[model samples]
Target: GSASPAVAELCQNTPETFLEASKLLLTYADNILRNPNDEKYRSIRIGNTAFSTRLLPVRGAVECLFEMGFEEGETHLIFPKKASVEQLQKIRDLIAIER
Candidate 1:
């Protein structure tokens, strides 16, 4: 599975790094706030904890995706989630890519 440090650590550790996490959330919020109709908006969520499995953590991957470029405010361009990802050489094929 994709090793998303931020997500993995967050779920494992009770409410870990709220400040950093909040900062990321704001980044996500900023993106959504500006362009609500964006396709990638579905890829992101606001405090929805309806996870497929409580055992497996997807936040890391999501956070990585968010870091990819999901930013606040945009100009004439295709607005994306601006997410970060687990590098190719960083890990093996145990991973999933966003839509």
Candidate 2:
């Protein structure tokens, strides 16, 4: 079965494995919502606009996978669903590693 764009888009530019993506997502969430105490990167407030910005790079990442041999998975709706750039980097890195 083909995964709808909307469903697949959720996982775009994400980790290859669901578990991997989940870990990355948690890390992202921490940076955005839970890093107020840390005085490293200013702990800026993440507005909707800011969110879309981060997501922009991800869409491209998804397209990169589709360009490769990534097959569409089951298009199930995941509520409260979730992962990382690095994890995605690994998937994208596969292009260099295995290609």
lDDT to native, each model: 0.37, 0.34
Model 2 stretches with alpha carbons more than 4 Å out: 1-7, 10-16, 37-99
Question: Could you tell me the lDDT of residue 57 within candidate 2?
Answer: 41
Tens digits of per-residue lDDT for model 1 on 1-99?
225454344443344443344344445445555565677743534333432232125345344333434332232112354433223212212222211
Over 4 Å off, model 1? 1-16, 45-99
Q: Give the Cα error of residue 32 in candidate 1, in Å.
A: 0.7
Clashes of each: 12, 5
Model 1 lDDT at residue 18: 32
For each candidate in turn, the TM-score is 0.29, 0.25
* Model 2 / residue 85 / CA error / Å: 19
Cα lDDT of model 2 by residue, 1-99, tens digit: 013232244454445543343333334334433443444422222333432344324544334333322333343111121223343344343333221
Alpha carbon RMSD to native, model 2: 12.6
Decoy 1 TM-score against native: 0.29
